[PDB]
Write a protein that binds this ligand. Structure first.
Ligand code: HEM
Length: 152
C-alpha cells in the first residue's frame, strides 16, 4: 500500500484535478481515445467521434469525463479502504462494458500524462511516484475482481 506521506501527496495532487474536473476529465479521455483507438470502440456513445476536434467539442465527453474523475476521486479519498466503492466499478467494467485490464493501464498512463501537460514543473518526482502507486493500487484491486469473474 501507500504510506501516509504518499497518500497526502496523492490527495494534494488531486486538488489540481478538482479545480477543473471537467477539463482534466476531457483531456484524460481524449488522450486515451487518441492514443488507443480500440478504447473508443467500447463506447457506443463516443464512436461517432472521428476527429479530436469533434472530441474536444463534445459536451457529452466532457460530461462523462466529470463522471469518471469524480468516481476515481472518491475512491482515492478512501486511501485504500475502497472495497465498497471499487467492487461495483470493477464488475460493471468487466461484465457490462467488457474493458480489458490493459485499458485501465492506458487510462492510468493518460492521467499521469495529463497532469504533466496541465501542470508542467508542478508535478514533481515524489508526486508522480505517489499518484502512480495510487493508480496501480486501484488497477491491481480491480484486477483481483476481474480474476474472480474470469474476465480477460
Ligand atoms: C480511472 C478508471 C475508470 C473509472 C473511475 C471509470 C468510471 C466510470 C463510471 C463511474 C462509469 C458509469 C457507471 C458505470 O457504468 O459503472 C463508467 C462507465 C463506462 N466506462 Fe469507465 N471508468 C474507468 C475506466 C474505463 C476504461 C479504461 C474504459 C475503456 C474504454 C471504460 C469504459 C466505460 C464504458 C464503455 C462505460 C459506459 C458509458 C456509457 O455508455 O454511458 N472505463 N466508467
Amino acid at each position: 500500500g501507500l504510506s501516509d506521506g504518499e497518500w497526502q501527496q496523492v490527495l494534494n495532487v488531486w486538488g489540481k484535478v478538482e479545480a477543473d474536473i471537467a477539463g482534466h476529465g476531457q483531456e484524460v479521455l481524449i488522450r486515451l481515445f487518441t492514443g488507443h483507438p480500440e478504447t473508443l470502440e467500447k463506447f457506443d456513445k463516443f464512436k461517432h467521434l472521428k476527429t479530436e476536434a469533434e472530441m474536444k467539442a463534445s459536451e457529452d465527453l466532457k460530461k462523462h469525463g466529470t463522471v469518471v474523475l469524480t468516481a476515481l476521486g472518491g475512491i482515492l479519498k478512501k486511501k485504500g479502504h475502497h472495497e465498497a466503492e471499487l467492487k461495483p466499478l470493477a464488475q460493471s467494467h468487466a461484465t457490462k462494458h467488457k474493458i480489458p485490464i490493459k485499458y485501465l493501464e492506458f487510462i492510468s498512463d493518460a492521467i499521469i500524462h495529463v497532469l504533466h501537460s496541465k501542470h508542467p514543473g508542478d508535478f514533481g518526482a515524489d508526486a508522480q511516484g505517489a499518484m502512480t502507486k495510487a493508480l496501480e493500487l486501484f488497477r491491481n484491486d480491480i484486477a483481483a475482481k476481474y480474476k474472480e469473474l474470469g474476465f480477460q
